Structure 1
């Protein structure tokens, strides 16, 4: 048997503190290759350990292809190979485009579907999984208008999360770290912020909000842990719901849903399954 392992790295589509993502080519087909910095080796090990435990396969989860470790003269090279989504991240997409009602709902219900799949334990199956870094940059847009969730480098099975998206109990260090349900409730908080980011870009009555990240109006770029703690925990601020949403039945329902992801009390927040059911009854 010939085992063709050569991947041609064609163009860099992402670079950050902790590595690069490349569009690559295997056997005439696009793949995405994440090349890890030595600084973020544990994200490669955690995602690899998870996929070695359960081969996740879901339309709303970025599709796994391979984990590769290659010996170099003085270092180890770590690659994660996945499906390639040419339309890029939701974060990217929402700057380039406004949404109609159908596309808005298809995006958010697809994200909820992916997240409920991660969260649910299946017997016979998969362990329950919490993501721990859900945000619009870790969601990819597919050609069919659904999204998929990426980056299980911080996932837990039953590095810290992006500070802008941290739930109040992470910022005030009251999270029950010995309780798996705590980590689901942190993802639900983050989901509510993503829902807000998407809903802003849905047109109603000729009106749309510009793309902004959550808390854009109350914290700096690269907010500190303390910046976020004072907004979210001490002052208990939440993202603004513009008046124009209350003229639109879809955005009225989505505002109620995002409120039920943002309760200070983590156990009051909706579950991913309840969010899907609610979204299927909207419109």
Structure 2
């Protein structure tokens, strides 16, 4: 049976689906509960299925991963819709949050350390207890799809382009997907079409590079650095609003371009640590990049 849900507001429109703030009126007498509904048309059934498989995976439950209530199929006059019902985070996406607010050092520490913890959890080949689990690579990490919870910690969602690192995966299966994701956040090796298709685990390195760009966005809006400029997306000054891969290749790969880090930012000890860490993470060489777990560990050291 379908949950008693009333759609309130359209909060997100993506290639695959629409996200709605909704009211779950389980009970007529008591106050309604705010939930999120991601709606996929029948044409996007595949994206719905990929996300559903992730959200319903018991091993994937984590504080930094969007909480999942249920998946439904709803017949409509036009056809059928595929729904994902989840917890709603009122603060919204990280990109919009950074645009509107200048964060404290404590905020940056919480946001950056929780982002790394969520990615590390997806990447992990084992559960906290010690049981083997099949790693997931997000493949489309960016500030626009990271939610901010009420306690100012990050929460991952938008798993439509995600890849389970299954051993049975073929080169043909992988190459066919090719460059998947947002061009602005693509790692240089992806822009170069230089990956080893047989090596599925190298996709973890691409996620780390995108994470580095997000960490830089958080850092750019932190008041600890000093004077804070208006929020700009990575490469905002260099490329157009919807950049192509050729143009991103030109900047990221040909010019080795990265978002600028003014030297005055380094004056703060904490900011310096974050900048050094993120710099290692966006290195041209994937091998030079730290793991998400390593980054989570460095953030732990930031209490000092």
The answer to whether TM tops 0.5 is yes
The answer to whether the 8 A contact 1:219-1:228 is kept is yes
Secondary structure of the structure 2 residue equivalent to 1:210: coil
C-alpha distance 53-248 of structure 1, shift in aligned 2 (>3 A): closer
**Structure 2 counterparts to residues 248-263 of structure 1, below 5 A:** 248-263=268-283
In 1, the alpha carbon distance for the partners of 2:54 and 2:85 equals 15
In 2, the alpha carbon distance for the partners of 1:47 and 1:214 equals 26
Once the 2 structures are TM-superposed, how far is the Cα of residue 277 of structure 1 from its aligned partner?
1.1
In 2, the alpha carbon distance for the partners of 1:37 and 1:226 equals 31
Question: Who is 2:81 aligned against?
Answer: 77
**Structure 2 counterparts to residues 92-111 of structure 1, below 5 A:** 92-111=96-115
In the alignment, is residue 131 of structure 1 matched against residue 138 of structure 2?
yes
In the alignment, is residue 8 of structure 1 matched against residue 6 of structure 2?
yes
The answer to whether the 8 A contact 1:121-1:127 is kept is yes
In 1, the alpha carbon distance for the partners of 2:225 and 2:251 equals 32
Secondary structure of the structure 2 residue equivalent to 1:143: coil
The answer to whether the 8 A contact 1:94-1:201 is kept is yes
The answer to whether the 8 A contact 2:2-2:72 is kept is no
**Structure 2 counterparts to residues 1-283 of structure 1, below 5 A:** 3=1, 5-26=3-24, 27=26, 28-38=32-42, 40-54=44-58, 56-122=60-126, 124=131, 126-158=133-165, 160-204=180-224, 206-282=226-302, 283=304
In 1, the alpha carbon distance for the partners of 2:272 and 2:193 equals 33
In 2, the alpha carbon distance for the partners of 1:157 and 1:272 equals 17
C-alpha distance 125-22 of structure 1, shift in aligned 2 (>3 A): farther
Give unmatched runs, 5+ long, in structure 1.
Answer: none
The RMSD of aligned alpha carbons is 1.8
C-alpha distance 15-61 of structure 1, shift in aligned 2 (>3 A): same
Once the 2 structures are TM-superposed, how far is the Cα of residue 52 of structure 1 from its aligned partner?
4.7
Once the 2 structures are TM-superposed, how far is the Cα of residue 55 of structure 1 from its aligned partner?
5.3
In 1, the alpha carbon distance for the partners of 2:249 and 2:290 equals 22
Once the 2 structures are TM-superposed, how far is the Cα of residue 41 of structure 1 from its aligned partner?
3.2
Instruction: Tell me the number of residue pairs that the alignment of Structure 1 and Structure 2 aligns.
Output: 281
In 2, the alpha carbon distance for the partners of 1:4 and 1:62 equals 21
Secondary structure of the structure 1 residue equivalent to 2:212: helix
Secondary structure of the structure 2 residue equivalent to 1:161: coil
Give unmatched runs, 5+ long, in structure 2.
Answer: 27-31, 166-176
In 2, the alpha carbon distance for the partners of 1:49 and 1:16 equals 19
In 1, the alpha carbon distance for the partners of 2:57 and 2:18 equals 25
In 2, the alpha carbon distance for the partners of 1:59 and 1:196 equals 22
The answer to whether the 8 A contact 1:54-1:126 is kept is no
In 2, the alpha carbon distance for the partners of 1:148 and 1:188 equals 16
Question: Who is 2:29 aligned against?
Answer: none
The answer to whether the 8 A contact 2:19-2:36 is kept is yes
